[PDB]
């Protein structure tokens, strides 16, 4: 429970920022069984990245989002895991930083923003 596992920590790992609602929807336990839930598409120039959700999921969530690059080079960030003093194991080093925004092409954006309006009106202080 002391040594660090670096045998497979050489691979670079993406750093992506997900929206609060999308991230919370992706914390579902039932979908954690290695299920293929989505896919990514990278432009030839790499400026535009599109995340497309698989049709296996319910139609209540938008199936298209876009990605933007924050830093072209990302250094001094590492990804680790800790398991049962606890045994820790580094996973890798971070390569790029990206942030997710909703896609205009998918109409469901409006719907969730509609829900956003539903969030805005109810709460008061």
């Amino acid at each position: 429970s002391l040594d660090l596992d670096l045998e497979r920590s050489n691979r670079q790992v993406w750093l992506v920022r997900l929206p609060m609602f999308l991230a919370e929807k992706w914390r579902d336990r039932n979908n954690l069984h290695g299920q293929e839930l989505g896919k990514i598409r990278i432009n030839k120039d790499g400026s535009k990245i599109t995340l497309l959700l698989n049709e296996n999921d319910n139609d209540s969530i938008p199936h298209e989002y876009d990605l933007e690059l924050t830093k072209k080079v990302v250094e001094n960030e590492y990804v680790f895991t800790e398991q049962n003093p606890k045994k820790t194991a580094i996973v890798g080093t971070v390569c790029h930083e990206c942030q997710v925004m909703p896609s205009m092409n998918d109409p469901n954006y409006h719907k969730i923003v509609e829900q956003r309006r539903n969030i805005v009106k109810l709460n008061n202080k």
Partner: protein, 103 residues
């Protein structure tokens, strides 16, 4: 310009996350520190639930890092672990800790 590569999106089940509690390990430095050379294995990590800060000390005691919990990180980060098939599995983030070197 429409060529794209395919990375399937997988996940890690509950049976693996139950005994694997994740914690974001952040080191504060101006230099690219790697444990392959800057840390002499094995390393001793302990707490001397968040009242006791983390302490990571080398075998020789030369590299001692003290880690504190930074709260209010409203960004719920995710861990993208690469499997043998090239797919990415999601791991939710529980806590984030920032480490600084002892004087």
């Amino acid at each position: 310009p429409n060529e794209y590569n395919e990375f399937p999106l997988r996940a890690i089940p509950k049976e693996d996350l139950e005994n694997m509690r994740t914690h974001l390990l952040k080191f504060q430095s101006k230099k690219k520190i790697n444990p392959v050379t800057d840390f002499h294995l094995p390393v001793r990590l302990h707490r001397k639930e968040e009242f006791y800060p983390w302490v990571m000390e080398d075998f020789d005691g030369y590299n001692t890092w003290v880690g504190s919990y930074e709260a209010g990180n409203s960004d719920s980060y995710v861990l993208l672990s690469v499997e043998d098939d090239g797919s990415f599995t999601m791991i939710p983030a529980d806590k984030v800790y920032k480490f600084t070197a002892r004087n």
